[PDB]
Short mmCIF file of C-alpha atoms in Angstrom, two decimals:
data_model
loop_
_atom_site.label_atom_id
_atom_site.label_comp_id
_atom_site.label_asym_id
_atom_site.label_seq_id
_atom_site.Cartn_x
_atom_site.Cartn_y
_atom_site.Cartn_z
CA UNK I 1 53.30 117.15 37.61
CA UNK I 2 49.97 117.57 36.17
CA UNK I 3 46.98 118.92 38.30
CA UNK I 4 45.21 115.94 38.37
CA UNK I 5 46.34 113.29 39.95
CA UNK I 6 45.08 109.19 40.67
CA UNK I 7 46.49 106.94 43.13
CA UNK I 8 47.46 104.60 41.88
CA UNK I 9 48.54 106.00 38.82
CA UNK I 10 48.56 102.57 36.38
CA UNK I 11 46.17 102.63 33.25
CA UNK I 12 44.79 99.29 34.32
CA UNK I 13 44.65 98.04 37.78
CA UNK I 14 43.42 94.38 39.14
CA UNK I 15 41.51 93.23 41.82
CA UNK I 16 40.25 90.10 42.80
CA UNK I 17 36.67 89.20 42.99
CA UNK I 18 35.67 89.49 46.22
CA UNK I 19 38.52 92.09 47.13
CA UNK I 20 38.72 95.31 47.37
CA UNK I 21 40.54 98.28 45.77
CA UNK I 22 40.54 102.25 46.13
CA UNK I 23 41.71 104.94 43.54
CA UNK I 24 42.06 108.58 44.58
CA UNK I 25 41.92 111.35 42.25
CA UNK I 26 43.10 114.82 43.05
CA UNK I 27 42.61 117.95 41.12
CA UNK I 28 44.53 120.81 42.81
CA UNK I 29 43.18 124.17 41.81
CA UNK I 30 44.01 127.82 42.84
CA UNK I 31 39.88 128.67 41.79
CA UNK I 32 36.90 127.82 43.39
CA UNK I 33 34.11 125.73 41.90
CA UNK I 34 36.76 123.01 41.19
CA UNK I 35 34.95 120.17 40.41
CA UNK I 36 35.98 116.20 40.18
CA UNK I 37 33.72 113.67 38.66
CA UNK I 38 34.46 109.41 38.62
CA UNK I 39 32.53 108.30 35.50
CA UNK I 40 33.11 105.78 32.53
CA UNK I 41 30.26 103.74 33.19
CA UNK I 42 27.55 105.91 33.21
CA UNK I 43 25.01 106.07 32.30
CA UNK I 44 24.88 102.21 33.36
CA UNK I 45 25.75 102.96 37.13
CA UNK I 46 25.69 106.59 37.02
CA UNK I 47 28.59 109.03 37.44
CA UNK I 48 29.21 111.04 40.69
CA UNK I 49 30.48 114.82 40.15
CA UNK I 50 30.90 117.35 43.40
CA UNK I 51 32.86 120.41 43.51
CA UNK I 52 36.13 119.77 45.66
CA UNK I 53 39.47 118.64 45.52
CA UNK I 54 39.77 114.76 45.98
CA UNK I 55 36.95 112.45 45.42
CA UNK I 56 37.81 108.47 45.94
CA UNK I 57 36.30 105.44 44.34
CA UNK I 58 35.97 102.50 46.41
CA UNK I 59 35.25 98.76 45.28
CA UNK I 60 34.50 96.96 48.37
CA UNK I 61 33.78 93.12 47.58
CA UNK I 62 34.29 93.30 44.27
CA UNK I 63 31.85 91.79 41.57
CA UNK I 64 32.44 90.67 37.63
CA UNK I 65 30.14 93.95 37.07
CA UNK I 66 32.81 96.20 39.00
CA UNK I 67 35.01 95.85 36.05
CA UNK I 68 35.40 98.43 33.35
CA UNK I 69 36.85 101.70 32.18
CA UNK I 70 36.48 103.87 34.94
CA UNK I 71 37.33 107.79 33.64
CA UNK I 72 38.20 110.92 36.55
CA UNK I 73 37.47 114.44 34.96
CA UNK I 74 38.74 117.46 37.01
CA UNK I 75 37.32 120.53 35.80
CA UNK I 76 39.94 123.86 37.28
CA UNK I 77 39.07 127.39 35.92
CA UNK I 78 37.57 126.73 32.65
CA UNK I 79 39.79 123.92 31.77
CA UNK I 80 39.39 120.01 32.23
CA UNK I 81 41.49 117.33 32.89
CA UNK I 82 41.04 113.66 32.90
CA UNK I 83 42.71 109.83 34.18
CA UNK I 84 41.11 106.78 32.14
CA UNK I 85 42.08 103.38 34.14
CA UNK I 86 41.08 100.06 33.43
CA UNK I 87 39.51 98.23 36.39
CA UNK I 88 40.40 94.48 35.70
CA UNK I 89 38.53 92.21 38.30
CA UNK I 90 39.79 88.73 38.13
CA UNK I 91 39.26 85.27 39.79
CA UNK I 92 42.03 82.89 40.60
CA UNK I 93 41.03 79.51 40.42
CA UNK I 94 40.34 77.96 43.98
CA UNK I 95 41.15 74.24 42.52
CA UNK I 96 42.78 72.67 39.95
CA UNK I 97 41.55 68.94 39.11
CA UNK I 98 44.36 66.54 36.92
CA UNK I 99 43.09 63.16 35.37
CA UNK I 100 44.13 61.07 35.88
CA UNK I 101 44.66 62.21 39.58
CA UNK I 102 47.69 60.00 39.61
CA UNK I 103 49.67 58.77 36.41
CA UNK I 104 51.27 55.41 35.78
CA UNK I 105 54.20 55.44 32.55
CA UNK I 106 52.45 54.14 29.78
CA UNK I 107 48.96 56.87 30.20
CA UNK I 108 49.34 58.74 27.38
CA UNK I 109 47.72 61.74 28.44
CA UNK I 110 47.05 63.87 31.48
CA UNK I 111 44.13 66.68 31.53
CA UNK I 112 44.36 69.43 34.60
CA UNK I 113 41.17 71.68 34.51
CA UNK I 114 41.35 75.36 36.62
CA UNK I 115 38.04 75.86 38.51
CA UNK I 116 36.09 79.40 38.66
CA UNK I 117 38.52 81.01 36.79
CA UNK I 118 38.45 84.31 34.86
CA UNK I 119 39.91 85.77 32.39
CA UNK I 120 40.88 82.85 30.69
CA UNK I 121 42.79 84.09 27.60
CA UNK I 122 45.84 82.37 26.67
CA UNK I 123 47.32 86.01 26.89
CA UNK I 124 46.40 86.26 30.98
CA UNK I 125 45.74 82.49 31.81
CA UNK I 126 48.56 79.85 30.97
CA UNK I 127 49.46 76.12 31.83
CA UNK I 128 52.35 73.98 32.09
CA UNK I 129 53.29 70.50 33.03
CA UNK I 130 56.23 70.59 34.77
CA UNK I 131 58.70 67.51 35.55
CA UNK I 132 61.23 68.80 39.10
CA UNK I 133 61.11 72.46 37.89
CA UNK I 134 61.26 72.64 34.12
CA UNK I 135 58.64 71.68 31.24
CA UNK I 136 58.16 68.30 30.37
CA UNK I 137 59.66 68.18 26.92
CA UNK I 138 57.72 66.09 24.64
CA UNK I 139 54.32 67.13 25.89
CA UNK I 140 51.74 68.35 23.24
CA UNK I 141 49.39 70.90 24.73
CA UNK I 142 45.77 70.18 23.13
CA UNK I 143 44.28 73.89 24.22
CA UNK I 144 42.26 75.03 26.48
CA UNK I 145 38.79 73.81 26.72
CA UNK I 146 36.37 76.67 28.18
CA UNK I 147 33.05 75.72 29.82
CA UNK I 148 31.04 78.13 32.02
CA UNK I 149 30.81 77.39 36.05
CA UNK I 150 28.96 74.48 35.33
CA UNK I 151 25.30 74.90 36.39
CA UNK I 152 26.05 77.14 38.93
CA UNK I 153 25.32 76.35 42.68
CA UNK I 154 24.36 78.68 46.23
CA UNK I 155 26.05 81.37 47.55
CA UNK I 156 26.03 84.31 45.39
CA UNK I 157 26.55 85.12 41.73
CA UNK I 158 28.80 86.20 39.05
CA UNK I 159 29.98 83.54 36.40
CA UNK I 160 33.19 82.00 36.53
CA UNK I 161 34.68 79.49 33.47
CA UNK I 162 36.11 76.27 34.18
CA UNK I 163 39.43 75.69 31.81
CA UNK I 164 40.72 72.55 30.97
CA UNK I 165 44.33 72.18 29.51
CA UNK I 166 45.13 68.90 28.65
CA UNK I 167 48.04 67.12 27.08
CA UNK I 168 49.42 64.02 25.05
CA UNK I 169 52.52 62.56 27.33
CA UNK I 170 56.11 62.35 25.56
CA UNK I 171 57.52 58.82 27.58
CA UNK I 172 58.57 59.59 30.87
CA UNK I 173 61.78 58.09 30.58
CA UNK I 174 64.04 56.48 33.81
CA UNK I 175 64.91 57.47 35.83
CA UNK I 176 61.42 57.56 36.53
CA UNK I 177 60.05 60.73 38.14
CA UNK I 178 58.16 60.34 41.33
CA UNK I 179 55.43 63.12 39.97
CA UNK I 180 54.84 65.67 37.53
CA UNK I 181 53.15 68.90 38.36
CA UNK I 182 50.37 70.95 36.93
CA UNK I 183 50.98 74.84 36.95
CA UNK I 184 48.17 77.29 36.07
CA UNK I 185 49.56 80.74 36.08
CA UNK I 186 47.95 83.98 35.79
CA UNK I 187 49.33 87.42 34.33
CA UNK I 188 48.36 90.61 34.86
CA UNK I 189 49.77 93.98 35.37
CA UNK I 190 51.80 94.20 38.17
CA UNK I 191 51.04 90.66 39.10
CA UNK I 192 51.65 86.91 38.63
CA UNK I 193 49.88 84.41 40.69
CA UNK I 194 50.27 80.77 40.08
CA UNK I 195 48.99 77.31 41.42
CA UNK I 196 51.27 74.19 41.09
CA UNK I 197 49.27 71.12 42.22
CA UNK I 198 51.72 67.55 42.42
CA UNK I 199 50.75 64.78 40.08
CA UNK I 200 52.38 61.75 41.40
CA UNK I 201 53.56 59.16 39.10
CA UNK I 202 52.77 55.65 40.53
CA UNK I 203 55.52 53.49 38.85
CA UNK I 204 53.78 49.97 39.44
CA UNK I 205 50.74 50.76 37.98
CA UNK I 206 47.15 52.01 39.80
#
């Protein structure tokens, strides 16, 4: 085991906006004048440095601006150490929109926008139209349309996007399905959260 030591111990860890997340570091030392220091954005921020053995970084109600590299150097007897983690804040979107809100056979398309999302790259954020619990095969994702939260309202701050997948419908076929289903799904280390909102399918028309 190496001398110092962060809890937890991943190179980037996630937390949701608004949440909160603590990472320990620990520098054990047979000298005195053992110093640990939490830095990586300093200088915009500032970096906090005390001699002792375990110094903790706390995000309580975490913003957009909580996110960042975040570097612990432990500094034992003339010789330094150091932890780099990634703090990834991210916001799950609270609503998903489809339009049409309801589909009749015959639309030929069907859009289903994520609200007050971030990140929203393709390599985090993902949809899918899903038909029982498979893809609907046939449908031709258009991409991802990214706006910013729209003209933001009240309440606090931080700026969220508002993504918009949308795609061209392959026939439904008949049977007839009694709804399809919109999936947003995000990816990140050590987590997958997901959203599956019903689109029903009226099959007389509407």
């Amino acid at each position: 085991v190496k001398p110092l030591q962060v809890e937890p111990p991943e190179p980037v860890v996630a937390v949701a906006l608004g949440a909160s997340r603590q990472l320990t570091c620990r520098l054990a030392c047979a000298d005195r004048g053992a110093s640990v220091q939490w830095r990586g954005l300093d200088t915009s921020l500032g970096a906090v440095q005390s001699d002792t053995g375990r110094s903790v970084l706390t995000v309580r109600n975490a913003s957009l601006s909580a996110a960042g590299t975040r570097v612990c150097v432990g500094s034992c007897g003339g010789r330094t150490f150091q932890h780099t983690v990634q703090l990834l804040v991210y916001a799950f979107p609270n609503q998903l929109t489809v339009s049409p809100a309801a589909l009749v056979p015959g639309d030929p398309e069907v859009a289903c926008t994520a609200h007050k999302v971030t990140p929203v790259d393709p390599n985090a954020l993902s949809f899918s139209l899903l038909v029982g619990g498979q893809e609907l095969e046939g449908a031709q994702a258009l991409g991802p349309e990214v706006q910013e939260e729209e003209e933001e309202p009240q309440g606090d701050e931080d700026v969220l996007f508002r993504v918009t997948e949308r795609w061209r419908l392959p026939p439904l076929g008949t049977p007839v399905p009694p709804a399809l289903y919109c999936q947003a799904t995000m990816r990140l280390p050590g987590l997958e959260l997901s959203h599956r909102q019903a689109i029903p399918v009226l099959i007389e028309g509407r």
